[PDB]
């Protein structure tokens, strides 16, 4: 149950399917040709948000991309503003914004806070930091969906039978509420960070010619890459 | 007859279909156009999701009706499954999975014939056509696998 696991080789993935489906054994073989390792994330409602959190912060840790940090802080300001224009009172989201902004700056090396891979791991492995950051991402997602209620409405009405506003309050904002495609499009646009989702299931339309397919979210290979198996996200590391 | 499918990035996919086609036929046509496996799609019309053994007719879908395409990307949820041999495995699931889908996932990992499987939770046998949400089984529950032949 650690919110985010140690780096494992893909052999542990392949051991889960070793005695089972040949399609999956092959897809995992093929996934090994592009990805070295995975980080399992705990399978609660927030696995996509937790995967994203850690993958992005690890990206800024490893890259020291100060320009990416500036850029995303602008996107975060504009989000702050749209939640303002939507009647959200600051005391309902701005604490989440402050916690995340501070994580982001702590991952930049050079100054006092400055943390390394291990303290980032324990921070995202500690309920009382990880959860606040999940919530930050949920509020950015909610903001982005309501800002575009008209575009997302036909997809949301079919997903749930809710209104966009309903959806936002019952499906996006609360802790634990599972995310889906709408959530991902919204967060990726809202923050402007690309995501590659490798889809690992048993589908095989072309017998004997197997590939792993993937869906790209792009507002330049996505530096966030997630493993998805119907129902659950972990983090992938490319070669 | 043509129909259109709108995607969450604003693309519009044009399909050639017949009113008697099933939703699975349409998903196959979408796979050919877009490269999305049919098991990964969710088609929507008039605020309703479209079920695989039903036809365009069944949903009143006529010439140049516009559908909507969402990818099956829901998460997080893992549950445990303990066999009676002390092996515990993890399973990736969704609250909408039928117990049948769950057994097909157990076959994906352990190769156990779904016809042989019985899943126990909370003192009862779990029924093939109900869902994990029917049972209010959430993340990190432990289902118990039991085998019977015939």
Curated annotation (Swiss-Prot), chain B:
Annotated site location: Essential for function: 68
GO annotation, cellular component aspect: cytoplasm; cytosol; endocytic vesicle membrane; endoplasmic reticulum membrane; endosome membrane; extracellular exosome; extracellular space; mitochondrial outer membrane
Record key words, sorted: ADP-ribosylation, Cytoplasm, Isopeptide bond, Membrane, Mitochondrion, Mitochondrion outer membrane, Nucleus, Phosphoprotein, Repeat, Ubl conjugation
GO molecular function: protein tag activity; RNA binding; ubiquitin protein ligase binding
A GO BP entry: modification-dependent protein catabolic process
Ranges where the Ubiquitin-like domain occurs: 1-76, 77-150
Cross-link Glycyl lysine isopeptide (Gly-Lys) (interchain with K-? in acceptor proteins) placement: 76
Outcome when changing residue 72 to G: No effect on ADP-ribosylation
Modified residues (ADP-ribosylglycine): 76
Protein origin, superkingdom: Eukaryota
Outcome when changing residue 68 to G: Loss of DTX3L-mediated polyubiquitination of histone H3 and H4
Site (Interacts with activating enzyme): 54, 72
Keyword Kinase: no
PTM annotation (Phosphoserine): residues: 65
Residue numbers bearing the (Microbial infection) ADP-ribosylthreonine modification: 66
Cell membrane is among the record's keywords: no
Numbered residues of crosslink Glycyl lysine isopeptide (Lys-Gly) (interchain with G-Cter in ubiquitin): 6, 11, 27, 29, 33, 48, 63
Effect of residue 72 to A: Impairs ubiquitination by CRL2(KLHDC3) E3 ligase complex. Impairs ubiquitination by CRL2(KLHDC3) E3 ligase complex
Note from the entry: Ubiquitin is encoded by 4 different genes. UBA52 and RPS27A genes code for a single copy of ubiquitin fused to the ribosomal proteins eL40 and eS31, respectively. UBB and UBC genes code for a polyubiquitin precursor with exact head to tail repeats, the number of repeats differ between species and strains. For the sake of clarity sequence features are annotated only for the first chain, and are not repeated for each of the following chains.
Family of this protein: Belongs to the ubiquitin family.
UniProt protein name: Polyubiquitin-C
Organism per entry: Homo sapiens (Human)
Region of the whole protein represented: 1 to 150 of 685
């Amino acid at each position: 149950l650690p919110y985010v696991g140690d780096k494992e080789p893909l052999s542990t993935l392949a051991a889960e399917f070793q005695s089972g489906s040949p399609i999956l054994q092959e897809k995992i073989k093929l996934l090994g040709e592009q990805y070295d390792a995975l980080r399992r994330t705990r399978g609660d409602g927030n696995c996509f948000y937790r995967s994203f959190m850690f993958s992005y912060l690890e990206h800024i840790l490893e890259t020291q991309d100060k320009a990416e940090v500036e850029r995303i802080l602008k996107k975060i300001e504009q989000c702050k503003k749209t939640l303002a224009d939507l009647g959200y009172i600051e005391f309902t989201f701005e604490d989440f914004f402050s916690i995340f902004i501070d994580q982001l700056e702590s991952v930049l090396q050079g100054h006092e806070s400055s943390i390394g891979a291990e303290e980032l791991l324990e921070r995202t492995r500690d309920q009382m930091v990880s959860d606040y950051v999940v919530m930050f991402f949920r509020f950015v997602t909610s903001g982005e969906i309501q800002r575009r209620a008209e575009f997302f409405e036909p997809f949301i009405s079919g997903l749930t039978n809710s209104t966009v506003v309903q959806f936002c309050k019952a499906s996006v904002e609360p802790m634990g509420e599972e995310s889906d495609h709408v959530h991902i499009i919204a967060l990726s646009d809202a923050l402007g960070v690309p995501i590659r989702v490798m889809y690992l299931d048993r589908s095989s339309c072309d017998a004997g010619n197997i590939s792993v397919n993937h869906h790209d979210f792009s507002p330049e290979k996505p530096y966030i890459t997630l493993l998805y198996r119907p129902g659950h996200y972990d983090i992938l590391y490319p070669k | 007859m043509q129909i259109f499918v709108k995607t969450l990035t604003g693309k519009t996919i044009t399909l050639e279909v017949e009113p008697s086609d099933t939703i699975e036929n349409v998903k196959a046509k979408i796979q050919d156009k877009e490269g999305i496996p049919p098991d990964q799609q969710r088609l929507i019309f008039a605020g309703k999701q479209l079920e695989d053994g039903r036809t365009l007719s069944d949903y009143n879908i006529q010439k140049e009706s516009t559908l909507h395409l969402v990818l099956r990307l829901r998460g997080x949820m893992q549950i445990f499954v303990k066999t009676l041999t002390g092996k515990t495995i993890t399973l990736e699931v969704e609250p909408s999975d039928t117990i049948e889908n769950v057994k097909a996932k157990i076959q994906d990992k352990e190769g156990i014939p779904p016809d042989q499987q019985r899943l126990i939770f909370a003192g009862k046998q779990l029924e093939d056509g109900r869902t994990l949400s029917d049972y209010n089984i959430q993340k990190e529950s432990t289902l118990h696998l039991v085998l019977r032949l015939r």
